[PDB]
Amino acid sequence: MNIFEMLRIDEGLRLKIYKDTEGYYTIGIGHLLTKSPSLNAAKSELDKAIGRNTNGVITKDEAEKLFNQDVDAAVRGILRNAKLKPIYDSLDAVRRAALVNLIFQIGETGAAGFTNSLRYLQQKRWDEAAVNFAKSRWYNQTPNRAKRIITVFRTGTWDAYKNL
Ligand SMILES: [Cl-]
Ligand SMILES: [Cl-]
Ligand SMILES: [K+]
């Protein structure tokens, strides 16, 4: 288990544009294209991203390329965010992966509302952090995925992703 295998499980792989859990145009391994309701707008974003006129369809290799860029950028942004970097640095590698996964899904701005939960993680109050993370729109909207991420933050093990 590692961050890529973890996010590959949570996001799946689709080589044609599709709508994510929020209704937004996405492709590949959870690569958000745009929040716009315009398919054409999403297709333009895809072409920009891949570097060619794709028509809404990409290769597995291309999907993987954007995926690598997304995870890298996610970690990197965590490191530049003063509200997140200290949390990240305080955790072990397993929990760190859980935090990258959360940000990949909700974005830094999304995480702005997780100050309390993040603080419990920094305090290493695992159970409390877990309880706190569940009290969120994120949890309510994607509970199965959230449960997984929360168990990871709670135990520091990949048990929730085994058998997946
Ligand atoms: Cl991109
Ligand atoms: Cl879910
Ligand atoms: K997805």
UniProtKB/Swiss-Prot annotation:
GO cellular component: host cell cytoplasm
Record field: pH dependence: Optimum pH is 7.3.
Outcome (variant: T26E): Complete loss of activity at neutral pH; covalently bound substrate
Signal peptide start-end: none
Keywords: Antimicrobial, Bacteriolytic enzyme, Cytolysis, Glycosidase, Host cell lysis by virus, Host cytoplasm, Hydrolase, Viral release from host cell
Keyword Transmembrane belongs to the record: no
Amino acids binding substrate: L32, F104, S117, N132
Result for mutant: N132I: 5-fold decrease in enzymatic activity
EC code: 3.2.1.17
GO BP, sorted A to Z: cell wall macromolecule catabolic process; defense response to bacterium; peptidoglycan catabolic process; viral release from host cell by cytolysis
Pfam assignment, any one: Phage_lysozyme
Catalytic activities: Hydrolysis of (1->4)-beta-linkages between N-acetylmuramic acid and N-acetyl-D-glucosamine residues in a peptidoglycan and between N-acetyl-D-glucosamine residues in chitodextrins
Induction: Expressed late in the viral replication.
One GO MF term attached to the UniProt entry: lysozyme activity
Result, substituting G30A: Almost complete loss of enzymatic activity
Annotated catalytic residues: E11 (proton donor/acceptor), D20 (proton donor/acceptor)
Main location: host cell
Phenotype for E11Q: Complete loss of activity
Location in or out of the cell: Host cytoplasm
Outcome after substituting E11N: Loss of 84% of enzymatic activity
Stated family: Belongs to the glycosyl hydrolase 24 family.
HAMAP family: ENDOLYSIN_T4
Function of the molecule: Endolysin with lysozyme activity that degrades host peptidoglycans and participates with the holin and spanin proteins in the sequential events which lead to the programmed host cell lysis releasing the mature viral particles. Once the holin has permeabilized the host cell membrane, the endolysin can reach the periplasm and break down the peptidoglycan layer.
Name of this protein: Endolysin
Organism from which the protein derives: Enterobacteria phage T4 (Bacteriophage T4)
Gene label: E
